[PDB]
RNA sequence: UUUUUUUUUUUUUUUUUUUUUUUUUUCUCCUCUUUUUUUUUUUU
């Protein structure tokens, strides 16, 4: 994703670092990549750490 | 007669655009004197 945080550039939120739905150890593969662009859609608000 | 362990050079690229020299001011302004105006003519 690309996040705007009033900086000189854009900030990148990698898919590898995200608490995906389920919130536990089940699996992480390319099947999630199709629905990753579904829940964190355009114009949402997050609160993360650099 | 002095062993064992302490990772490293950001990820990304396959974006659209249908105009045209210049460009924008300055006011009214007393002309002195022999004249009517000479004139054909010929040699270029």
From Swiss-Prot:
Q: Where in the cell is it found?
A: Cytoplasm; Nucleus, Nucleolus; Nucleus
| Residues annotated as domain S1 motif | 1-50
Which residues are recorded with the post-translational modification Phosphoserine? Answer: 29
Any S-S bridges, and between which cysteines? Answer: none
Domain of life of the native organism: Eukaryota
Instruction: Write down the disease named in this UniProt entry.
Output: Short stature, hearing loss, retinitis pigmentosa, and distinctive facies: An autosomal recessive disorder characterized by childhood myopia, early onset retinitis pigmentosa, progressive sensorineural hearing loss, hypothyroidism, short stature, brachydactyly, recognisable facial gestalt, premature ageing and mild intellectual disability.
Q: How does it assemble?
A: Component of the RNA exosome core complex (Exo-9), composed of EXOSC1, EXOSC2, EXOSC3, EXOSC4, EXOSC5, EXOSC6, EXOSC7, EXOSC8 and EXOSC9; within the complex interacts with EXOSC4 and EXOSC7. The catalytically inactive RNA exosome core complex (Exo-9) associates with the catalytic subunit EXOSC10/RRP6. Exo-9 may associate with DIS3 to form the nucleolar exosome complex, or DIS3L to form the cytoplasmic exosome complex. Exo-9 is formed by a hexameric base ring consisting of the heterodimers EXOSC4-EXOSC9, EXOSC5-EXOSC8 and EXOSC6-EXOSC7, and a cap ring consisting of EXOSC1, EXOSC2 and EXOSC3.
Stated family: Belongs to the RRP4 family.
Functional summary from the UniProt entry = Non-catalytic component of the RNA exosome complex which has 3'->5' exoribonuclease activity and participates in a multitude of cellular RNA processing and degradation events. In the nucleus, the RNA exosome complex is involved in proper maturation of stable RNA species such as rRNA, snRNA and snoRNA, in the elimination of RNA processing by-products and non-coding 'pervasive' transcripts, such as antisense RNA species and promoter-upstream transcripts (PROMPTs), and of mRNAs with processing defects, thereby limiting or excluding their export to the cytoplasm.
The name this protein carries in UniProt is Exosome complex component RRP4
Native organism taxonomy: Eukaryota, Metazoa, Chordata, Craniata, Vertebrata
